[PDB]
């Protein structure tokens, strides 16, 4: 059909006219590569569609219309505010109690579409009052009584009211959701997993107010459990959510590290995926910035040595990472940990990076030595360090950023090799 | 040294999905 045709369909009296026009505006919506939304939008076909959603009567149109509104509010910010400026999110929200289950799916859809374009719609979209009538859906005795087409809409959708910040969505909205997402997170659907895992993974990126809402529900031990599933669509966000839930308090970190999260961790530091290295390696640099009971326990679940690997063997963004993990540990470690830590070969991979051009990461490098030197004095064996630098092929690299353009750089450099250049108590 | 927040995300889920 032309757009010329679905209009004069669209604006025929004849109810039946009506629906062949929304079918054959469904099909270019939806089977087209090169959908001409803005065509349909133009036309003013919106308002129409958005009003064919309350005929009760005709739920046939009632879906087609809810296909077609679906689909123009999946485009641009411009065509989704035009389905929105058309009266649709509470026209949707009214068909969330459709007794045919397929229709209330679509608008489930159809409203997340709406939700995910930002902070503004989605806050509109509660504003509405979709959150009641959404988790009502989800509020029956077994969740296996739901299709699970239908329930991962429902889990997407969901995910796309916790979605985003500036600003956050409301914490009243977040308290109400949060109890459901708990029960969807034992769920055995994969897709849903990693729907609930995003969700999560969102409501964990803020404050630390916003963290132990998350943590208080009792998601954390199953979170790290859904850590080492096969599934790389769950790891990612469920990495994502734990990683965020350790930028927290010290009290929350331990949540993560008492639910047995470091035990998963050597498989994500060493992942098939480079993404997945970075986020793990990340994660452990802010664990590493924790008391020194958490670097403990850090060295106790042997990943160390990983961390070691990570310094010499990943790629580079991954590497940045591991420099801060390592430095997070030499700041707040005991001289023992330290120790341990030369022990594990430390000195020439953390190193080699000041070959690196990156001024950040070179200065918290030099720190890091800083750091074991430190740790050095107090046992009185700074020589020996120094001539374990020196073999690790460090001093070379230490006097070469004595010609550096920065001047942090060029005065860190020139007091390492001014001071240090002119059991587990001994780095033995 | 203290705790740092994330970069941003890589492999994002999606925002909006049409119906095909």
């Given at each position: 059909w032309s757009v010329?045709?679905?209009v004069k369909g669209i604006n025929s009296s004849n109810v039946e006219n009506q629906l062949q026009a929304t079918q054959a505006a469904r099909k270019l919506l939806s089977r087209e590569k090169q959908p001409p939304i803005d065509n349909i939008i133009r036309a003013g076909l919106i308002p129409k569609f958005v009003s064919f959603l309350g005929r009760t009567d005709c739920s046939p149109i009632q879906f087609e219309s809810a296909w077609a509104l679906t689909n123009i509010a999946s485009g641009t910010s411009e065509q989704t505010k035009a389905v929105v400026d058309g009266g649709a999110i509470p026209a949707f929200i009214s068909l969330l109690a459709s007794p045919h289950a397929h229709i209330s799916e679509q608008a489930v859809w159809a409203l997340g579409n709406i939700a995910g374009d930002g902070s503004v719609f989605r806050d509109l979209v509660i504003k509405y009052g979709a959150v009641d009538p959404l988790?009502?859906?989800?509020?029956?005795?077994?969740?296996?009584?739901?299709?699970?087409?239908?329930?991962?809409?429902?889990?997407?959708?969901?995910?796309?009211?916790?979605?985003?910040?500036?600003?956050?969505?409301?914490?009243?909205?977040?308290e109400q959701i949060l109890p459901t997402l708990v029960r969807l997170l034992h769920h055995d659907d994969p897709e849903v997993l990693a729907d609930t895992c995003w969700a999560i993974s969102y409501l964990t990126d803020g404050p630390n107010e916003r963290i132990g809402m998350v943590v208080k529900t009792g998601v954390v031990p199953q979170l790290v459990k859904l850590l080492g599933?096969?599934?790389?669509?769950?790891?990612?966000?469920?990495?994502?959510?734990?990683?965020?839930?350790?930028?927290?308090t010290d009290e929350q970190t331990q949540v993560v590290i008492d639910a047995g999260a470091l035990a998963v961790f050597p498989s994500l530091l060493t992942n098939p995926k480079t993404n997945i290295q970075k986020e793990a390696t990340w994660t452990m640099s802010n664990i590493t910035a924790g008391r020194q009971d958490q670097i403990?326990?850090?060295?106790?679940?042997?990943?160390?040595?990983?961390?070691?690997?990570?310094?010499?063997?990943?790629?580079?963004?991954?590497?940045?990472?591991?420099?801060?993990?390592?430095?997070?540990?030499?700041?707040?470690?005991?001289?023992?940990?330290?120790?341990?830590?030369?022990?594990?070969?430390?000195?020439?991979?953390?190193?080699?990076?000041?070959?690196?051009?990156?001024?950040?990461?070179?200065?918290?490098?030099?720190?890091?030595?800083?750091?074991?030197?430190?740790?050095?004095?107090?046992?009185?064996?700074?020589?020996?360090?120094?001539?374990?630098?020196?073999?690790?092929?460090?001093?070379?690299?230490?006097?070469?950023?004595?010609?550096?353009?920065?001047?942090?750089?060029?005065?860190?450099?020139?007091?390492?090799?001014?001071k240090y250049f002119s059991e587990g108590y001994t780095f033995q | 040294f203290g705790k740092r927040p994330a970069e941003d995300m890589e492999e994002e889920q999606a925002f909006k999905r049409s119906r095909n």
């Open positions: 010329d045709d679905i988790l009502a859906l989800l509020a029956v005795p077994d969740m296996s009584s739901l299709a699970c087409g239908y329930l991962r809409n429902l889990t997407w959708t969901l995910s796309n009211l916790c979605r985003n910040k500036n600003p956050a969505p409301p914490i009243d909205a977040v599933a096969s599934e790389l669509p769950i790891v990612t966000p469920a990495l994502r959510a734990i990683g965020n839930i350790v930028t927290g403990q326990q850090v060295v106790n679940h042997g990943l160390v040595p990983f961390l070691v690997s990570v310094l010499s063997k990943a790629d580079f963004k991954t590497q940045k990472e591991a420099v801060w993990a390592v430095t997070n540990y030499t700041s707040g470690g005991t001289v023992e940990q330290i120790v341990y830590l030369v022990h594990c070969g430390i000195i020439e991979p953390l190193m080699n990076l000041l070959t690196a051009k990156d001024t950040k990461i070179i200065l918290v490098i030099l720190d890091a030595i800083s750091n074991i030197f430190q740790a050095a004095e107090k046992l009185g064996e700074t020589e020996k360090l120094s001539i374990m630098i020196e073999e690790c092929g460090g001093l070379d690299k230490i006097e070469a950023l004595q010609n550096h353009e920065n001047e942090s750089v060029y005065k860190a450099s020139l007091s390492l090799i001014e | -």
